[PDB]
Coordinates of C-alpha atoms and ligand atoms in Angstrom, one line a residue:
X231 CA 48.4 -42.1 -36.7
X232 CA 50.9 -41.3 -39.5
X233 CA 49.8 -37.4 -39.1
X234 CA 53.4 -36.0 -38.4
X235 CA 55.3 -37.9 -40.3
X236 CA 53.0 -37.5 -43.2
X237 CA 52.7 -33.8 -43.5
X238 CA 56.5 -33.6 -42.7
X239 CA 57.0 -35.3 -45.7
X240 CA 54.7 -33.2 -47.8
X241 CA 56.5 -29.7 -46.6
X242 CA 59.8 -30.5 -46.0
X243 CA 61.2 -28.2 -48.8
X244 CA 58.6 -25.4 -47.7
X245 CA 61.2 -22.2 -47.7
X246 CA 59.3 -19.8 -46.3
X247 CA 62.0 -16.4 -46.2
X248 CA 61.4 -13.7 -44.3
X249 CA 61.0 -10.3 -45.8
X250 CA 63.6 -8.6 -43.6
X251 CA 66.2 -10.5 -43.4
X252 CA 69.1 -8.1 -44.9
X253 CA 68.2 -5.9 -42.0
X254 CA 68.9 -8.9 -39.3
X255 CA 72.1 -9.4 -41.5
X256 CA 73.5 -6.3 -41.6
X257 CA 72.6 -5.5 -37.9
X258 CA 74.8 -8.7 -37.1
X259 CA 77.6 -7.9 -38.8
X260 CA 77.3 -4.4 -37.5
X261 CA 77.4 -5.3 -33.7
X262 CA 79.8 -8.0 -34.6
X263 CA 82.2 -5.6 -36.0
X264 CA 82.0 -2.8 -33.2
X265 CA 81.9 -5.5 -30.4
X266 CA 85.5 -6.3 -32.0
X267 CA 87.1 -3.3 -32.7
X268 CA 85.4 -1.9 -29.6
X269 CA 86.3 -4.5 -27.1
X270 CA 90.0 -4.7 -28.5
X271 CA 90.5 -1.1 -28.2
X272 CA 89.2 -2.1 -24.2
X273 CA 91.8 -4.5 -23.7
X274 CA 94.9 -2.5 -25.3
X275 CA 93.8 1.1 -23.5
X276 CA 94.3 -0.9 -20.1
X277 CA 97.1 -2.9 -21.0
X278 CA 99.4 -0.2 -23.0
X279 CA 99.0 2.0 -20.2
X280 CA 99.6 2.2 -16.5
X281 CA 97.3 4.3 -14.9
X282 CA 94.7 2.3 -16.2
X283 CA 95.8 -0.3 -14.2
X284 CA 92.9 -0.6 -11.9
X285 CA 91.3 -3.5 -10.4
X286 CA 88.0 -2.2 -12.0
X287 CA 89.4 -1.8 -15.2
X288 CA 91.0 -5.3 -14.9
X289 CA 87.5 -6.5 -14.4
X290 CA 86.2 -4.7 -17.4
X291 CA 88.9 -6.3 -19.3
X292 CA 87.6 -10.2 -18.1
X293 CA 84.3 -9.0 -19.3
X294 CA 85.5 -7.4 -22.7
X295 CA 87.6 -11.0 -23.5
X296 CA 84.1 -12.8 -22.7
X297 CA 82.1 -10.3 -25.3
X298 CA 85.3 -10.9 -28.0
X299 CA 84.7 -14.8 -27.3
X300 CA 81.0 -14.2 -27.5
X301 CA 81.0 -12.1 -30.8
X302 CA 84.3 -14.2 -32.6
X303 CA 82.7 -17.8 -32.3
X304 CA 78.8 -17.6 -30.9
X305 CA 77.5 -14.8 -33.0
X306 CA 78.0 -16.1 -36.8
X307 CA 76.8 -19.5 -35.6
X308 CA 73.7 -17.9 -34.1
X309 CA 72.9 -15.8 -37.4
X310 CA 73.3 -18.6 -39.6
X311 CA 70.8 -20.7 -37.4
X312 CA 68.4 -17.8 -37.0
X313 CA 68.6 -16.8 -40.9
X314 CA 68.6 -20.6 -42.6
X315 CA 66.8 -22.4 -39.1
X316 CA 69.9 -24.8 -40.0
X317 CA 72.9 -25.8 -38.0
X318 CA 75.4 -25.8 -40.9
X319 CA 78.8 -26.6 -38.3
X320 CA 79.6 -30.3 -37.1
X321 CA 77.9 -32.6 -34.2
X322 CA 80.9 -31.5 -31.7
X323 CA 80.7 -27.5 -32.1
X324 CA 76.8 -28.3 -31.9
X325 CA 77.9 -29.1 -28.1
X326 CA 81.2 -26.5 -28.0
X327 CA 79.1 -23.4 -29.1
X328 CA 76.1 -22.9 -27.1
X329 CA 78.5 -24.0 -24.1
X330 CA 80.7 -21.1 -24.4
X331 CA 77.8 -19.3 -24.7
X332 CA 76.8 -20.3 -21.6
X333 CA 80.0 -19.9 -19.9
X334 CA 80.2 -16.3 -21.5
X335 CA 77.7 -15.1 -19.6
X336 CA 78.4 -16.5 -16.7
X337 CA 81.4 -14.8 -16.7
X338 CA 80.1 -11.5 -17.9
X339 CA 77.8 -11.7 -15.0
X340 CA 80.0 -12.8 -12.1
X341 CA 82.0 -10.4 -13.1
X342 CA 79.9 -7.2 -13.2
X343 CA 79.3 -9.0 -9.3
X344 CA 82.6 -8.5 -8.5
X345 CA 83.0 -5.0 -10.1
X346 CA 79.7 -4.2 -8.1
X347 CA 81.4 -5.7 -4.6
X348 CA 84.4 -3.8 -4.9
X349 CA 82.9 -0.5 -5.6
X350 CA 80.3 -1.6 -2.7
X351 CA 83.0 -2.1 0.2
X352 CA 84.8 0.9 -1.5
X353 CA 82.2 3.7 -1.1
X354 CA 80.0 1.6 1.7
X355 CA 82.8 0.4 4.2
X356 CA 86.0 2.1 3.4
X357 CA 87.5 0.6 6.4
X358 CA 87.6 -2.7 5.2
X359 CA 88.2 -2.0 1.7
X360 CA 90.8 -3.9 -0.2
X361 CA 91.4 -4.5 -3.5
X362 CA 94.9 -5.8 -4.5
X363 CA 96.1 -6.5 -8.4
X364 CA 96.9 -10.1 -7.4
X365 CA 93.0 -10.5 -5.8
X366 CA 92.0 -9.3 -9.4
X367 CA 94.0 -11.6 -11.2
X368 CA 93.0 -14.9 -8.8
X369 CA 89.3 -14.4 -8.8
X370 CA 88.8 -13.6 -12.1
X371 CA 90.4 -17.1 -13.1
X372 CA 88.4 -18.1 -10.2
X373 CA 85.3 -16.7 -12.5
X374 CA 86.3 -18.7 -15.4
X375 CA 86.3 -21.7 -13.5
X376 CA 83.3 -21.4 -11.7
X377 CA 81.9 -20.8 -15.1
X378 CA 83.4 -23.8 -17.3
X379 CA 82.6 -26.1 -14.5
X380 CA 79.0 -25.3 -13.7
X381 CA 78.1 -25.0 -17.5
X382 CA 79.0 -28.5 -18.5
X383 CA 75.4 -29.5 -18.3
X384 CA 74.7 -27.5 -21.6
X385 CA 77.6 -29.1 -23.1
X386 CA 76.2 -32.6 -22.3
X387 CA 72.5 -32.2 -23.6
X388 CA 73.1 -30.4 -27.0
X389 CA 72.6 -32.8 -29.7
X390 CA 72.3 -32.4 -33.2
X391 CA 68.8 -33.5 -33.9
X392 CA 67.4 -34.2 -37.9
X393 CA 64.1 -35.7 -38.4
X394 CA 61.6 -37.6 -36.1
X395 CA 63.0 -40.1 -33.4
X396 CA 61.9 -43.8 -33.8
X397 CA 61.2 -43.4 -37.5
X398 CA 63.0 -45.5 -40.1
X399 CA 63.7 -43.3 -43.3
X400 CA 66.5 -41.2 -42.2
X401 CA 66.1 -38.5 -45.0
X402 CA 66.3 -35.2 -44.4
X403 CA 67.1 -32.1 -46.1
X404 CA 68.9 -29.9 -42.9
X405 CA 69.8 -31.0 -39.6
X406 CA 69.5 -28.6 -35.9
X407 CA 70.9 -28.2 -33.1
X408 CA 69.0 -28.4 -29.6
X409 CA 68.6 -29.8 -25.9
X410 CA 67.8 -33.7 -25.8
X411 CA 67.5 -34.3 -21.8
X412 CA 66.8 -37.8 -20.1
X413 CA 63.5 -36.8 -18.2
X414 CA 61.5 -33.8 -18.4
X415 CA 62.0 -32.5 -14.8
X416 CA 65.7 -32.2 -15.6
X417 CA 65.4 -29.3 -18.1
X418 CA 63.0 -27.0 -16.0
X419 CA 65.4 -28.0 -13.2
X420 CA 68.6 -26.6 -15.2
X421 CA 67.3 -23.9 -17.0
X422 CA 65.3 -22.5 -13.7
X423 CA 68.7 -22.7 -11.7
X424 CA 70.4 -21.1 -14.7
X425 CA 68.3 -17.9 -14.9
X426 CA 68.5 -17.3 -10.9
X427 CA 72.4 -17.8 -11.1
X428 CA 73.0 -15.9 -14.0
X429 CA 70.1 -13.4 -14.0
X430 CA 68.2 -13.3 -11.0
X431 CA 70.6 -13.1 -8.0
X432 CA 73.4 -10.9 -9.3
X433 CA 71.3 -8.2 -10.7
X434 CA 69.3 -8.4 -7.7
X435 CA 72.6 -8.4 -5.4
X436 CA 73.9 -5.8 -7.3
X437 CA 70.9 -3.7 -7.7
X438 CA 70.8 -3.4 -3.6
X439 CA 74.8 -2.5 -3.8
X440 CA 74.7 0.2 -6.0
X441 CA 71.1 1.3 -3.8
X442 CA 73.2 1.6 -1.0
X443 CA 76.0 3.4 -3.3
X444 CA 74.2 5.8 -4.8
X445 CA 72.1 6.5 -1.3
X446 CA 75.9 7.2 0.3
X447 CA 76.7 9.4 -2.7
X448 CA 73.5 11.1 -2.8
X449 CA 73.9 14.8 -2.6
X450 CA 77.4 14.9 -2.7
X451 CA 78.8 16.4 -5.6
X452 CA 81.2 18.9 -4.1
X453 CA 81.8 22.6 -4.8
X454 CA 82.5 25.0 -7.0
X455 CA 86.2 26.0 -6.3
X456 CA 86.2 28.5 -9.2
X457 CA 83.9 30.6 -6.9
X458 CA 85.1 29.4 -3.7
X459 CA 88.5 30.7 -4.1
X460 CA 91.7 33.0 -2.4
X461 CA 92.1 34.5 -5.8
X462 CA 89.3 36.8 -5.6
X463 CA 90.4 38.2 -2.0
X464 CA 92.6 40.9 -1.9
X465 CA 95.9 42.2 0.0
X466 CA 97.2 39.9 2.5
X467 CA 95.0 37.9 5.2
X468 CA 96.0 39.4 8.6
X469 CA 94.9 42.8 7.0
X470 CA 91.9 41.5 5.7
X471 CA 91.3 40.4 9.5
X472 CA 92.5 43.9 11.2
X473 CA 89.6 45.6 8.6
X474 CA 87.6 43.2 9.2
X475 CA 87.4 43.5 13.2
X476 CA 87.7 46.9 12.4
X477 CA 84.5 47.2 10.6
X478 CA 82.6 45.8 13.1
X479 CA 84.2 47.7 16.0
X480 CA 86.7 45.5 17.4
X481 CA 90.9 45.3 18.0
X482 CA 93.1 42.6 16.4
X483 CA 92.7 39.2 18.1
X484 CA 92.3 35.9 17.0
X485 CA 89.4 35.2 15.5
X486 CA 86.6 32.4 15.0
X487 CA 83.4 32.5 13.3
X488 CA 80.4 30.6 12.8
X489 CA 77.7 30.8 9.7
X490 CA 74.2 28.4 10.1
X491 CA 70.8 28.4 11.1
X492 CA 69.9 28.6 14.9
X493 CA 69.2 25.2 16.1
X494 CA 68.7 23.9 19.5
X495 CA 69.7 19.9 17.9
X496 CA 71.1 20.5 13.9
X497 CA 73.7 23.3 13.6
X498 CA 74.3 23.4 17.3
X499 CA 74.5 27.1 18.2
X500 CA 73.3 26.4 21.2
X501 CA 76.5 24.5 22.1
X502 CA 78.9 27.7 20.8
X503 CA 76.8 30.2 22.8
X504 CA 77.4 27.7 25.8
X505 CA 81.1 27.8 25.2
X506 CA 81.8 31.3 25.0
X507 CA 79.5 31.4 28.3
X508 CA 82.3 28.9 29.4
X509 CA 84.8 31.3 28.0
X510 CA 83.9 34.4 29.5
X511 CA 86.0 33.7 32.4
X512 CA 89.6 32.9 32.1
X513 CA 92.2 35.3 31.2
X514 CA 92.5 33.9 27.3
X515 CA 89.5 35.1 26.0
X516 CA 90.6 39.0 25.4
X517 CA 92.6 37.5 22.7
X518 CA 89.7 35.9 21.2
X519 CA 87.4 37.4 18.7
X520 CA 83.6 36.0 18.2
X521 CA 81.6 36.2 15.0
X522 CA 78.4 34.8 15.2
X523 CA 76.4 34.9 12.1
X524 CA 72.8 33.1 11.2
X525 CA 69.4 33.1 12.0
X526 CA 66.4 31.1 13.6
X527 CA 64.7 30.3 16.9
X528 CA 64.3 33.8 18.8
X529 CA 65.4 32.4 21.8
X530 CA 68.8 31.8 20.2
X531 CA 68.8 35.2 18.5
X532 CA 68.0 36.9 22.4
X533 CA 71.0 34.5 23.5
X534 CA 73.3 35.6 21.0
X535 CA 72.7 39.7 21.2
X536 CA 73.1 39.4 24.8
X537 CA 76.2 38.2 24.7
X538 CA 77.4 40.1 22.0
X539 CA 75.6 43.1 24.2
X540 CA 78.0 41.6 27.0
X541 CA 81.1 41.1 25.5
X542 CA 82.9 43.8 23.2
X543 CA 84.6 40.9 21.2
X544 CA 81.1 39.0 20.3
X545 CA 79.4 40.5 17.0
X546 CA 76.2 38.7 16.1
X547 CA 74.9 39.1 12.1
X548 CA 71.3 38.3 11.6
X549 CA 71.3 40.1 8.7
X550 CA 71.4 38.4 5.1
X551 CA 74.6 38.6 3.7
X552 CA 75.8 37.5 0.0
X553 CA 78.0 34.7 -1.1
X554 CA 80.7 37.0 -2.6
X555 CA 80.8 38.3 1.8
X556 CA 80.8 34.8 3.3
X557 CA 84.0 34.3 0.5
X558 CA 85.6 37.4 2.2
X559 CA 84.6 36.4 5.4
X560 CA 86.1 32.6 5.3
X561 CA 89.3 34.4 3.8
X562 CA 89.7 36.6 6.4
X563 CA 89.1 35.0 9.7
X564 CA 91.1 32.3 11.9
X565 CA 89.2 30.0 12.6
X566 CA 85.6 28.7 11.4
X567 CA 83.5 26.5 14.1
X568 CA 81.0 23.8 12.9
X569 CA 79.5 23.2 16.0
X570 CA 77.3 20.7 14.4
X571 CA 74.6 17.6 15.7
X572 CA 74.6 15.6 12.4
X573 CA 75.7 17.1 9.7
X574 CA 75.7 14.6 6.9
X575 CA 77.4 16.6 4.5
X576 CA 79.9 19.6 5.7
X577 CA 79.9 22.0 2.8
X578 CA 80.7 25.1 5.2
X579 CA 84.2 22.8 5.9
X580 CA 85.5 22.9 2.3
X581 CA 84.5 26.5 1.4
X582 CA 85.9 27.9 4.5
X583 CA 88.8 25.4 4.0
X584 CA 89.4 26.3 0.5
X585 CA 89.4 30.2 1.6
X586 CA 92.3 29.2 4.0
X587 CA 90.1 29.2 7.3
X588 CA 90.6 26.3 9.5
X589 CA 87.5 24.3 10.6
X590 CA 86.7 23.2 14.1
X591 CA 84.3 21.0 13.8
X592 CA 82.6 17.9 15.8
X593 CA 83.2 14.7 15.0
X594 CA 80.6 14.1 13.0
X595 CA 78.6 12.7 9.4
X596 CA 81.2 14.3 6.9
X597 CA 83.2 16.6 8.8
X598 CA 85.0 13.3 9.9
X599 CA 85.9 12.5 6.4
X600 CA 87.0 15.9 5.2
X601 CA 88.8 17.0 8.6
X602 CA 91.6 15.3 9.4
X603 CA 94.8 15.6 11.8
X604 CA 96.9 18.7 10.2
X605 CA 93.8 20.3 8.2
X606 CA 91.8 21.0 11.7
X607 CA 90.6 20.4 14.9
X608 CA 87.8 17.8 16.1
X609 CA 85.5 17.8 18.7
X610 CA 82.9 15.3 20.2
X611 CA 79.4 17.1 19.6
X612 CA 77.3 18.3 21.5
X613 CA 79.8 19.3 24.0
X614 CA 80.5 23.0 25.5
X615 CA 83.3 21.8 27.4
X616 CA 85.6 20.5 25.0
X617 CA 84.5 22.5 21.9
X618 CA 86.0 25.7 24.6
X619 CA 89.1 23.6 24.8
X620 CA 89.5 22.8 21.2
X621 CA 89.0 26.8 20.9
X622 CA 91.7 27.6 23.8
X623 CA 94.0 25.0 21.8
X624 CA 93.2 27.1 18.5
X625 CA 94.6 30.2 20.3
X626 CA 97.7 28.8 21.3
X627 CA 98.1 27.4 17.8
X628 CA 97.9 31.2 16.9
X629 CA 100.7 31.8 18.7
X630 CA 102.8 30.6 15.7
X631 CA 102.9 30.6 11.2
X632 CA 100.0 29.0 10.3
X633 CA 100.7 29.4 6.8
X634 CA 101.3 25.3 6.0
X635 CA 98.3 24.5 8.4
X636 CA 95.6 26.4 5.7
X637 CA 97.5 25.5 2.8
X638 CA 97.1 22.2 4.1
X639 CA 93.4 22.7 4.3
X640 CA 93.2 23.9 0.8
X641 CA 94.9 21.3 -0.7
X642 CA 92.6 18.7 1.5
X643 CA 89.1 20.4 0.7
X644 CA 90.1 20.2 -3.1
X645 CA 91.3 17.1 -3.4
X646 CA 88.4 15.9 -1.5
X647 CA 85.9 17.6 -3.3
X648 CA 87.5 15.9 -6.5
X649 CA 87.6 12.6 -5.5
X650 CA 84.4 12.3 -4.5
X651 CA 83.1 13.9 -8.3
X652 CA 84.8 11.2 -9.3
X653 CA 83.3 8.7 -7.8
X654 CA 80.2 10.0 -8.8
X655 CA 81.1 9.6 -12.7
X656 CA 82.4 6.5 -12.1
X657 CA 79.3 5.0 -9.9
X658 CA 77.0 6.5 -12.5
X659 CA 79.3 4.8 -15.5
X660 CA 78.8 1.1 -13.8
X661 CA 75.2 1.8 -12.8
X662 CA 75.0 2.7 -17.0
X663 CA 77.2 -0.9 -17.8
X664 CA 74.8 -3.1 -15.3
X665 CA 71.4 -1.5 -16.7
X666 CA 72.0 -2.2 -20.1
X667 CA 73.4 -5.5 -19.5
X668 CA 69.8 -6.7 -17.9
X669 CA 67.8 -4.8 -20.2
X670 CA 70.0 -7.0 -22.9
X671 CA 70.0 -10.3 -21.2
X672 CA 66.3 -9.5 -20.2
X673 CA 64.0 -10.9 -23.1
X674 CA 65.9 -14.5 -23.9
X675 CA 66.0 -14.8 -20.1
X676 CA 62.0 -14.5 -20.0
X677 CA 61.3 -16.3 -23.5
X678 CA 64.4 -19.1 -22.1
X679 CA 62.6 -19.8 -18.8
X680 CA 58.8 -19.8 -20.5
X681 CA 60.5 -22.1 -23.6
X682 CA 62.1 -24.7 -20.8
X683 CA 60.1 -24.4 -17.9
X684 CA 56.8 -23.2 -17.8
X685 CA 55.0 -24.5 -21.1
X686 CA 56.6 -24.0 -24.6
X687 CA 55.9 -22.4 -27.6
X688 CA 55.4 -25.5 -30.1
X689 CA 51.7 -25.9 -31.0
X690 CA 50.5 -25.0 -34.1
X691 CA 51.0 -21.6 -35.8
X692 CA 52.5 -20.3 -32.9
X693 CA 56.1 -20.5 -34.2
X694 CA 56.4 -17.8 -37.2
X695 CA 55.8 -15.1 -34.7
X696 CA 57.9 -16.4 -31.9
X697 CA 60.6 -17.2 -34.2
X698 CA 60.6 -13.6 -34.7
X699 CA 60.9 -12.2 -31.1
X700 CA 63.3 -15.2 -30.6
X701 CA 65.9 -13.5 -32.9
X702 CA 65.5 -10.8 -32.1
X703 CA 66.3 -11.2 -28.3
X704 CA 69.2 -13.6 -29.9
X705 CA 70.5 -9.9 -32.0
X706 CA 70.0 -8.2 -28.9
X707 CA 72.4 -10.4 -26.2
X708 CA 75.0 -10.2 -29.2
X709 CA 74.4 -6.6 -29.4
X710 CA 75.2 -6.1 -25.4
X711 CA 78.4 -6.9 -26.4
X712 CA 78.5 -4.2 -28.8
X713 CA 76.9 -2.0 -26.2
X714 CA 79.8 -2.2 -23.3
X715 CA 82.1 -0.3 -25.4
X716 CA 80.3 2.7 -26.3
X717 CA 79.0 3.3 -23.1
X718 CA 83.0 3.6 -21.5
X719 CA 83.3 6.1 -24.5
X720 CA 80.9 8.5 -23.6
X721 CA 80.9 7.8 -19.4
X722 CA 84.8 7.5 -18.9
X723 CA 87.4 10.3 -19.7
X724 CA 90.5 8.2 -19.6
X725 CA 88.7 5.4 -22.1
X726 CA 87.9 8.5 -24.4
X727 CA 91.7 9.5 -23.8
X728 CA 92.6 6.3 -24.7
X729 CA 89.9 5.3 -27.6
X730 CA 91.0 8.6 -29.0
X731 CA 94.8 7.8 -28.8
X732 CA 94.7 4.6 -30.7
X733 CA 94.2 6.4 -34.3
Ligands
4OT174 C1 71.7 -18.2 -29.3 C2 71.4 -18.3 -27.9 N1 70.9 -19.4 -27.3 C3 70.7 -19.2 -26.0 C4 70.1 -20.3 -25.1 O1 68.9 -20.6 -25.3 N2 70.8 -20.9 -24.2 C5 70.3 -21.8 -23.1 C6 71.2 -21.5 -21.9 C7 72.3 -20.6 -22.4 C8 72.2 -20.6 -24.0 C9 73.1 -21.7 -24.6 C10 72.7 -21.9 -26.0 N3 71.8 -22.6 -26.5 N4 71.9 -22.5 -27.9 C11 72.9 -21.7 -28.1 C12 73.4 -21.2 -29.4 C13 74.5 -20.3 -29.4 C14 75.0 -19.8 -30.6 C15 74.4 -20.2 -31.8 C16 73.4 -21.1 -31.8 C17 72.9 -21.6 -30.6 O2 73.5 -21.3 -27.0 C18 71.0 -18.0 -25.5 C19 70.9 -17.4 -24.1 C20 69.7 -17.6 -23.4 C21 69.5 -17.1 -22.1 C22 70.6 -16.4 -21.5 C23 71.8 -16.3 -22.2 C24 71.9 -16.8 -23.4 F1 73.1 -16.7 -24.1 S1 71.5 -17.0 -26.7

């Protein structure tokens, strides 16, 4: 009957001290002291400076002041517990503590969530995208208060238990800190709830979100406008054209080319061959030029020689040709025409763009984003009639400069090309930030919802091995903190820029 209280009394100044303790120690002072210097030198590179100003970065702040809360108050109170099994601080921060801690990472969460959202409706729906300063600043305290409400629970049921309930010598040598609930349903209740809210649903949100990201980013990582580039032509353009049509047997006229497989529903020759068939009446299409280049269905290929058997202003290439050629080729002609069914990507657009020729295109996949009004002309696909239009438009475009049109076109294929690198870093950055937060957060989550929920590890000589894994996974949700830092320091330039600055 008097078991417990019995054998509590004949090892209650059993000090049992781990071997490796220094090493739990010095690994807690180690991520406390980079989660400090690391997550200030956060704060100040985004504050000091104003292209830094972004809502994302404003969001990276909120999370870097949760980490500083985190590593300033929670983290010595959780090694002194895990290295002396002790709470040595009063009854009220025996509530305040593991509260913030709470709240922390709610707010760390939430606001990877929102950092996820805004980079979701960004890259997925550009449309609707908006992200002003003031709808940073307004959620985010939004966040906080969300989080300090929701966590009051925690706060409620810490209590700073000693010895035994219902026993009558009140001696002790230490006193701890833990969770005394009303019933037993209550705790599984709470602590089930917390790990879907603060684990289960916004990873898993945000897991689909930067799915459907990196799927629209996927393949897009631009081109290489050191080779793509005017520099390498040489003399002016309109000569480059005049030898050009002179090499393959033809006078000076305005000129359009196309460069893809033959496709009767991809690259849509089909529809270019149909337009020039369109074209061969009318008295406008002397003063057009036709170079068709590429290679694939036979039928196509007898289509295309025909007509350029026809017509002394159609040559037809089906021989391979090198990219060095293709560079001349886009830096020599008028006009380039993208005839395309569905092309999700448009490479041929910014090459040819960068090399000064200007795309006509149809309305489609990425040739929507790169070509705009000013850098080109757009067509709905799979339409002869109306591609021959936008071609009979091109030619009385001809008719004047030019010059600011494919400068326009350069300037538009680089800095799309660049922004879309970016996004690419900085996608791959949060991807990085959200990773290591769950593999962090991951093991207390599953010991947490095991401990509270499903069973408990309290029988026997189960504990000096779970007391173990338990500090460990305690080091490792400290160490997260630690973690955010680094990981802007070796995945964002300007945060290197900036890290760099401050000594
Ligand atoms: C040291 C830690 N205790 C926990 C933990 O069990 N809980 C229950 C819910 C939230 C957190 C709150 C808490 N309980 N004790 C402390 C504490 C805090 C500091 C010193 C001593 C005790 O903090 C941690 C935790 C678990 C799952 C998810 C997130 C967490 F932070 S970390």
């Amino acid at each position: 009957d008097y078991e417990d209280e019995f054998l509590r009394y004949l090892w209650r100044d059993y000090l049992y001290p781990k071997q490796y303790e220094w090493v739990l120690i010095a690994a807690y002072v180690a991520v406390f002291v980079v989660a400090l210097v690391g997550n200030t030198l956060v704060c100040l590179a985004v504050w000091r400076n104003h292209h830094m100003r972004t809502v994302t970065n404003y969001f990276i702040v909120n999370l870097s002041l949760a980490d500083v809360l985190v590593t300033a108050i929670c983290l010595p109170a959780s090694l002194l517990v895990d290295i002396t099994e002790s709470w040595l601080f009063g009854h009220a921060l025996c509530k305040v503590i593991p509260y913030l801690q709470a709240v922390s990472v709610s707010v760390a969460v939430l606001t990877l969530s929102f950092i996820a959202l805004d980079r979701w409706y960004a890259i997925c729906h550009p449309l609707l995208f908006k992200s002003t300063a003031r709808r940073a600043r307004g959620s985010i305290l939004g966040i906080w208060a969300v989080s300090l409400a929701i966590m009051v629970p925690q706060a409620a049921v810490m209590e700073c238990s000693s010895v035994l309930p219902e026993l009558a010598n009140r001696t002790r040598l230490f006193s701890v800190c833990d969770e005394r609930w009303a019933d037993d349903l209550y705790p599984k209740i709470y602590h089930s709830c917390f790990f879907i809210v603060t684990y289960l649903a916004p990873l898993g949100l945000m897991a689909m979100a930067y799915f459907q990201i990196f799927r629209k980013l996927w393949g897009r990582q631009g081109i290489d406008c050191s080779f793509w580039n005017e520099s390498y032509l040489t003399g002016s353009r309109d000569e480059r054209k005049k030898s050009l049509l002179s090499k393959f047997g033809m006078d000076e006229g305005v000129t359009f080319m196309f460069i893809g497989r033959f496709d009767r529903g991809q690259k849509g020759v089909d529809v270019l061959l149909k337009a020039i068939e369109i074209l061969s009446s009318k008295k406008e299409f002397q003063e057009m030029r036709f170079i068709i280049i590429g290679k694939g269905d036979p039928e196509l290929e007898g289509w295309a020689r025909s007509l350029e058997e026809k017509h002394g202003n159609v040559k037809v290439i089906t021989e391979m040709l090198s990219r060095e050629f293709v560079r001349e080729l886009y830096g020599s002609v008028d006009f380039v025409i993208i005839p395309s069914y569905f092309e999700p990507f448009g490479l041929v657009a910014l090459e040819a763009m960068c090399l000064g020729a200007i795309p006509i295109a149809s309305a489609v996949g990425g040739l929507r984003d790169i070509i705009t009004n000013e850098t080109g002309i757009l067509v709905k696909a799979g339409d002869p009639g109306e591609l021959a239009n936008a071609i009979l438009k091109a030619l009385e475009l001809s008719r004047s400069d030019l010059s600011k049109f494919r400068e326009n076109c350069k300037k538009r294929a680089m800095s799309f090309s660049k922004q879309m690198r970016a996004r690419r870093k900085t996608a791959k950055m949060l991807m990085v930030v959200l990773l290591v937060f769950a593999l962090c957060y991951l093991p207390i989550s599953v010991l947490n919802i095991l401990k509270r929920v499903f069973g408990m590890f309290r029988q026997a000589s189960d504990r000096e091995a779970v007391y173990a894994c338990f500090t460990f996974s305690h080091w490792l949700v400290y160490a997260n903190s630690a973690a955010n830092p680094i990981i802007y320091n070796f995945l964002s330039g300007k945060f290197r820029e900036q890290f760099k600055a401050a000594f």
